[PDB]
Enzyme design. Structure first.
Site, PDB file in Angstrom:
ATOM      1  N   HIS B  68       0.156 -13.014 -13.706  1.00 50.82           N
ATOM      2  CA  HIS B  68      -0.569 -11.754 -13.768  1.00 50.82           C
ATOM      3  C   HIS B  68      -0.195 -10.865 -12.619  1.00 50.82           C
ATOM      4  O   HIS B  68      -0.846 -10.847 -11.577  1.00 50.82           O
ATOM      5  CB  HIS B  68      -2.077 -12.015 -13.704  1.00 50.82           C
ATOM      6  CG  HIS B  68      -2.885 -10.808 -14.062  1.00 50.82           C
ATOM      7  ND1 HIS B  68      -3.761 -10.842 -15.119  1.00 50.82           N
ATOM      8  CD2 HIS B  68      -2.965  -9.577 -13.484  1.00 50.82           C
ATOM      9  CE1 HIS B  68      -4.360  -9.662 -15.185  1.00 50.82           C
ATOM     10  NE2 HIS B  68      -3.881  -8.893 -14.230  1.00 50.82           N
ATOM     11  N   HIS B  70       1.359  -6.861 -11.645  1.00 51.90           N
ATOM     12  CA  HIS B  70       1.710  -5.477 -11.990  1.00 51.90           C
ATOM     13  C   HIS B  70       3.045  -5.061 -11.388  1.00 51.90           C
ATOM     14  O   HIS B  70       3.109  -4.226 -10.462  1.00 51.90           O
ATOM     15  CB  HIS B  70       0.639  -4.480 -11.520  1.00 51.90           C
ATOM     16  CG  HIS B  70      -0.619  -4.844 -12.234  1.00 51.90           C
ATOM     17  ND1 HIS B  70      -0.884  -4.415 -13.526  1.00 51.90           N
ATOM     18  CD2 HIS B  70      -1.624  -5.651 -11.836  1.00 51.90           C
ATOM     19  CE1 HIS B  70      -2.048  -4.921 -13.858  1.00 51.90           C
ATOM     20  NE2 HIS B  70      -2.499  -5.643 -12.864  1.00 51.90           N
ATOM     21  N   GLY B  75      -2.857   0.565 -10.494  1.00 50.78           N
ATOM     22  CA  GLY B  75      -3.821   1.493  -9.934  1.00 50.78           C
ATOM     23  C   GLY B  75      -3.880   2.751 -10.753  1.00 50.78           C
ATOM     24  O   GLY B  75      -3.591   2.723 -11.951  1.00 50.78           O
ATOM     25  N   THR B 106      -5.122  -0.569 -16.578  1.00 50.76           N
ATOM     26  CA  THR B 106      -5.912   0.592 -16.962  1.00 50.76           C
ATOM     27  C   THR B 106      -5.051   1.747 -17.476  1.00 50.76           C
ATOM     28  O   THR B 106      -5.329   2.327 -18.500  1.00 50.76           O
ATOM     29  CB  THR B 106      -6.826   1.055 -15.788  1.00 50.76           C
ATOM     30  OG1 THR B 106      -7.535  -0.059 -15.302  1.00 50.76           O
ATOM     31  CG2 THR B 106      -7.877   2.058 -16.267  1.00 50.76           C
ATOM     32  N   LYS B 162      -1.485  -7.822 -23.934  1.00 51.24           N
ATOM     33  CA  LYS B 162      -2.616  -7.732 -23.037  1.00 51.24           C
ATOM     34  C   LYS B 162      -3.628  -6.733 -23.622  1.00 51.24           C
ATOM     35  O   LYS B 162      -3.244  -5.861 -24.396  1.00 51.24           O
ATOM     36  CB  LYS B 162      -2.068  -7.140 -21.723  1.00 51.24           C
ATOM     37  CG  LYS B 162      -3.141  -6.574 -20.781  1.00 51.24           C
ATOM     38  CD  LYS B 162      -3.752  -7.716 -19.989  1.00 51.24           C
ATOM     39  CE  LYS B 162      -4.766  -7.289 -18.924  1.00 51.24           C
ATOM     40  NZ  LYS B 162      -4.220  -6.308 -17.982  1.00 51.24           N
ATOM     41  N   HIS B 201      -8.388  -9.019 -20.078  1.00 49.95           N
ATOM     42  CA  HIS B 201      -8.898  -8.595 -18.776  1.00 49.95           C
ATOM     43  C   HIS B 201     -10.419  -8.556 -19.000  1.00 49.95           C
ATOM     44  O   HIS B 201     -10.908  -7.947 -19.963  1.00 49.95           O
ATOM     45  CB  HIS B 201      -8.422  -7.163 -18.384  1.00 49.95           C
ATOM     46  CG  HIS B 201      -9.393  -6.465 -17.479  1.00 49.95           C
ATOM     47  ND1 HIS B 201      -9.226  -6.435 -16.109  1.00 49.95           N
ATOM     48  CD2 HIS B 201     -10.574  -5.839 -17.749  1.00 49.95           C
ATOM     49  CE1 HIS B 201     -10.225  -5.759 -15.586  1.00 49.95           C
ATOM     50  NE2 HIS B 201     -11.063  -5.399 -16.546  1.00 49.95           N
ATOM     51  N   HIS B 230      -9.739 -13.083 -14.722  1.00 45.51           N
ATOM     52  CA  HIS B 230     -10.723 -12.534 -13.759  1.00 45.51           C
ATOM     53  C   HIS B 230     -12.094 -13.183 -14.030  1.00 45.51           C
ATOM     54  O   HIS B 230     -13.110 -12.536 -13.883  1.00 45.51           O
ATOM     55  CB  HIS B 230     -10.926 -11.003 -13.891  1.00 45.51           C
ATOM     56  CG  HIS B 230      -9.659 -10.225 -14.021  1.00 45.51           C
ATOM     57  ND1 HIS B 230      -8.550 -10.518 -13.254  1.00 45.51           N
ATOM     58  CD2 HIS B 230      -9.354  -9.167 -14.830  1.00 45.51           C
ATOM     59  CE1 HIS B 230      -7.584  -9.663 -13.605  1.00 45.51           C
ATOM     60  NE2 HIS B 230      -8.050  -8.846 -14.547  1.00 45.51           N
ATOM     61  N   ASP B 285      -3.032 -11.114  -9.882  1.00 44.87           N
ATOM     62  CA  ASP B 285      -3.364  -9.742 -10.175  1.00 44.87           C
ATOM     63  C   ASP B 285      -2.649  -8.871  -9.088  1.00 44.87           C
ATOM     64  O   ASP B 285      -3.006  -7.723  -8.764  1.00 44.87           O
ATOM     65  CB  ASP B 285      -4.877  -9.437 -10.319  1.00 44.87           C
ATOM     66  CG  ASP B 285      -5.031  -8.148 -11.086  1.00 44.87           C
ATOM     67  OD1 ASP B 285      -4.077  -7.616 -11.592  1.00 44.87           O
ATOM     68  OD2 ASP B 285      -6.217  -7.623 -11.116  1.00 44.87           O
TER      69      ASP B 285
HETATM   70 ZN    ZN Z   1      -7.387  -6.824 -14.992  1.00 50.97          ZN
HETATM   71 ZN    ZN Z   2      -4.321  -6.805 -13.696  1.00 49.69          ZN
END
Ligand code: ZN
Ligand code: ZN
Ligand code: ZN
Ligand code: ZN
Ligand code: ZN
Ligand code: ZN
Ligand code: ZN
Ligand code: ZN
Lengths: 378, 378, 375, 375
Positions: B68, B70, B75, B106, B162, B201, B230, B285
């Site tokens: 996991h 990015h 952000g 996001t 995801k 998530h 999470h 993450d």
């Molecule tokens: Zn997440």
């Molecule tokens: Zn994440």
């Protein structure tokens, strides 16, 4: 000397005919790929340039209709090496199959309806009769024209749509999506002169037939357009299929599934349960992935078993593969030996072994071996 | 003089090996980036042009798999100045990470799967092993080919999809949309030879895991393809995750979340609850937004804590980062030290401090510092 | 006893090695599907658990690279029954082919790049190496992702695009459409690390190479990215081809086309024309309508036998020249670090053994490894 | 008594047969809608349950093939009220037409290929034989599946594409668009086993055939796939048409256009110009704006009567020439194995009976079989 050879006159003499109905010793006269007369003692000279065939001691029945075949290949569930190859003409014919319905399965990413359509046409051109279903396991359906209704209405060889439910390989369709799709297939078939059926690949989910019942509660598609297949795959599912058939539905048993409910067993139970043979069909799921690929020998095997180990009459034994299928799909000219029908016939030994096969009046198999092969068969 | 240097023969001698299984003092022979032999006392001259490494007094274990991250940056939740930058090779390697799974969060407006895909490939080219997930928080998924099933089936580096649920940053997906997406990922993976997972998530909504249960009631995707992440973010959620794991699901703990359930604590409780380590993973993450950005030090930290403050054996401590991850994602050749596996190894001090890192048999970190850097690292 | 079998050590000893360069009698050591050492007299005990193969008296050379194969089947030009079946593994390996590039032709209605892509992957899994071209005769191209540029950049197995010109089965493309398509392949190649080539099926139209020249005047794609194939189909075309090669282009001769310019003949004339072998390739067009793969090897035999070529040279068009044109790293040459794709032949050039990525695929001239559904 | 009526045995006896070739007095035996024997003196008892028809003193010939009919209606050029109604079965059969090709014209907004396709199917069910062309005057073409190439390859009844050039109602197509569209039809024809032709409605523009020539220089579609129709609409166009035919093309004369070049006249001049009848066709443009079908037969009468044609020859443009151009297997000739599509005429060429696929459709000059909703 007048040439009348264009007619292709063929007289099939003296076999014990099962139309599938027992007609006893009876003759069959063919012309232009059509059955033109069925009767006892047809004068061998009734027509000029007539090929006469002595079937004395043999049996004559209609050619099988296999409504579940992966004509262009299937598999692929375990990676790309598992994509099976396309079906070869001879495999079908030596198996007694004169009419086929092609379809797609799990993979609709590397398999396309256009490919399936081309293959369907090649088979007709090569000598047998073939149709297909649009869609595949995936819901919403992947089609040729962009719409299920449009595909069934306008593509000549398309007779309905396929999908998958209660299976870990489904697209997790909701009732609406299913209802809509069946409704489109139904309507498209009225317009196109097709049966407009919806065929449901059944998996092993515990929900079994539920979605079909849900669907019927959410639409006006007649129960007679809905066909659950692979019903013998698990007991509880089989049991529900029986009641489904009891309510007026037709159920399709897969010849390639031996356990837990063997094919002949499945058919026998239906009868025990009081279900009319007209509502029971048998299909192979041929060319799907089994690693091996499912063949077509299981069709004939089932008839033999039913007769030999189950006490069915030959006539009854033949239905699920002939008249019931034609009956369900409205395949005019197929599944029965009547004047005016297509000359799709099997010639068997009394022990139910195929010797010759005629498709549209043309000799395709002789002495149990194909004499007409696919264009690229080697 | 014959040159055998192409083989890249390397002999790693005398460390105490945790495969993660405790193998005691044992040697490891590498060639062509592969582990070719694991045994006590391998003759330092068994192969020509062999680089011999004295690991006496050190520990040898498999490289971590961080599922996991990015990779291209994350952000953006508080405006454009909050878009974090892309991940640099050295950060991963110095952290003990040899295999990574990149994903989006996001923001799927200024972040695209194609960008993520390119970055994934650069990382493989640079020396480590990388895959990705298609989609992002948004449901329906934003993909590369237009379809989740097609992305998983045909894009080599894509292994699943995801999404986000029970979070104030969700797309407010309904069960159908979720079911369909998971079903597509599942199917796409069969076809493509991928795990076909769906990663969720989880946010802080009180509904917690509900949607996952709802989904399972509305589809046939096996519970083993569904991964909530999470889970340590809130207690009630954590508690439900335990039962989810009890029912056969796998749960992912985020190393970068300290409260209310710290990572080592979370893992310890799982074990207390009787959950098998095989069903527990740990991911960072990393590179998400924390304003700071989440790093990768928390991975190693968790192993240290588990051993030092929790009484776990080193072997047990390693699982969530190695074998359990490989196990879940079916990453063949990774997570375990066996002949035939890739030579992704960590060399640590007895106090669990990383000294060297090998990725595919190549020395990436020496003396705890990266000797191989990203192309643009300065 | 320590087990080292995971390495798959194999020592090929005593053969006369053509890398394709003649290297005399020399040994080849293999591990993990890669060539790890090339030298005379490698010690049989140099590595543990070593399989030693005595090839004395035989010839060793690189596996062939056939860049023009209708992997999923082709045909369909005379209706549905003319659609050929997909290619089986053993047909390729038995013909000395260890690397292949698949493509589509006339039919891109019943044939799809997604299907071609799966078959490509299947073959790689089965033991050989395969890539594909996106598009088909039809221009604009029918792609997987909707853009030629995107297909080449993002689909790992795609290395360029195919099209048809000067042929009665073309889509009547104009220069703009051709230029744009070539430029997209070019750019995608760069982004994806692919050669980014444009392969042109040539037909018998009198316009011959015209469209290519036109294209060149309408874009900035390098000449070295444009490949006309079937150049030996007619004389004027062949001759024009020689000129194009002289200008810096590479040309692909079709082994399955015997008249009016035979394959070996075409190769000999190219050379006699001053063109380096590096700019001449040979491909089969195998599985089209069913064309087989035996003409490949036969061309090599003929060059040597009837054209005065040395073996080294005769091998180039199927090995180093292709690998070089397509930038197939690790292929086409027997060098430490390259893939163990090798052929074992008799001195008279008959195939005996074939190794793909170090795995024995054909033995005694017979496939000993077959496709999943091979009957 | 055994029943053999399923065969539909019919024996047509004693007529003077023009196959179109003059065969003198000869008999024709039919079964299952197919011609099974052609010979003088077939025995009336040769087959059981035989319907014998004494045609002595009459002429027998192949049914006409009208390749240019606005089956669903046409018109609309002067507003909504000018949209003509669909064609009724009996209007066709009474005019000797047993095979037809439907198409669209100017209006492709209120007229759709899907509607045309259903009507085509209706007619086949009703007893005659029908096909259609995709597209309309508008270029790019409006199709069923979104691609001209796809329509031709996959829709069974589609055999080519229609378009308009040199006319004030065209879409101002450029050469590229025209070339591409022709090439798509060509290729689809191959895949689907269709002729894959391009039919060009010609208008009165001075550019006349120019666009065609241009097209030819911009693609590799064979000249034999391009059909200009309405060529007799103006002189210069007609004359240019003769030349195009001389180059190998086929030309379609419109029976409904009487000036400045009448149908029979045009046919006579073509022949006098050295063009074989095989490359000359006649179509009605029936149902456009409501043009009927009687001019077909009249043209035949005039050729014989005023132009010195033999009957055989006069028949060609409506029979063998069309069937041959469109590759309509089983149509246009009275041969064993062909469909029983026959006309019964008086020696003065008046239609008496018509059989379509062996079924009696018109008797005593009157339809005895009608369309489903025919009033
Ligand atoms: Zn997440
Ligand atoms: Zn994440
Ligand atoms: Zn199924
Ligand atoms: Zn199936
Ligand atoms: Zn070609
Ligand atoms: Zn080709
Ligand atoms: Zn017109
Ligand atoms: Zn018109």
């Amino acid at each position: 000397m007048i040439d009348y050879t264009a007619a292709g006159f063929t007289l099939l003499q003296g076999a014990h005919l099962y139309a599938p109905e027992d007609r006893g010793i009876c003759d069959v006269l063919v012309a232009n790929g059509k059955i033109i007369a069925v009767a006892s003692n047809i004068p061998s000279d009734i027509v000029p340039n007539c090929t006469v065939v002595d079937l004395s001691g043999q049996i004559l029945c209609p050619g099988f209709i296999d409504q579940h075949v992966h004509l262009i290949g299937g598999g692929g569930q375990a990676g790309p090496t598992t994509r099976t190859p396309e079906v070869a003409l001879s495999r079908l014919t030596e198996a007694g199959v004169t009419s086929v319905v092609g379809l797609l399965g799990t993979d609709s990413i590397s398999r396309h309806p256009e490919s399936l359509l081309a293959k369907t046409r090649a088979l007709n051109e090569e000598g047998i009769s073939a149709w297909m279903l649009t869609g595949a396991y995936h819901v919403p359906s992947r089609t040729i024209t962009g719409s299920v209704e449009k595909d069934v209405a306008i593509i000549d060889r398309v007779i309905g749509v396929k999908c998958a439910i209660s299976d870990h390989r489904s697209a997790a369709p909701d009732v609406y999506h299913l209802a809509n799709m069946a409704a489109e297939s139904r309507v498209g078939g009225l317009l196109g002169g097709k049966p407009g059926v919806t065929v449901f690949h059944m998996g092993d989910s515990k929900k079994a037939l539920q979605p079909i019942y849900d669907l019927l509660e959410n639409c006006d598609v007649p129960i007679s357009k809905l066909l659950p297949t692979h019903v013998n795959r698990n007991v509880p599912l089989f049991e529900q299929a029986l009641e489904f058939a009891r309510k007026g539905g037709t159920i399709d048993i897969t010849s390639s599934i031996d356990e837990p409910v063997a094919p002949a067993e499945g058919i026998a139970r239906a009868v025990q349960a009081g279900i009319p043979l007209a509502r029971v069909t048998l299909s192979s799921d041929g060319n799907g992935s089994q690693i091996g690929v499912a063949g077509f020998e299981t069709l004939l095997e089932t008839v033999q078993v039913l007769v030999k180990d189950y006490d069915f009459s030959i006539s009854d034994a033949l239905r699920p593969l002939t008249s019931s299928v034609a009956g369900f799909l409205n395949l005019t000219g197929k599944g029965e030996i009547l004047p005016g029908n297509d000359a799709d016939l099997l010639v068997m030994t009394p022990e139910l072994r195929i010797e010759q096969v005629y498709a549209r009046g043309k000799l395709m198999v002789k002495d149990g071996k194909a004499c007409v092969k696919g264009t690229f068969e080697t």
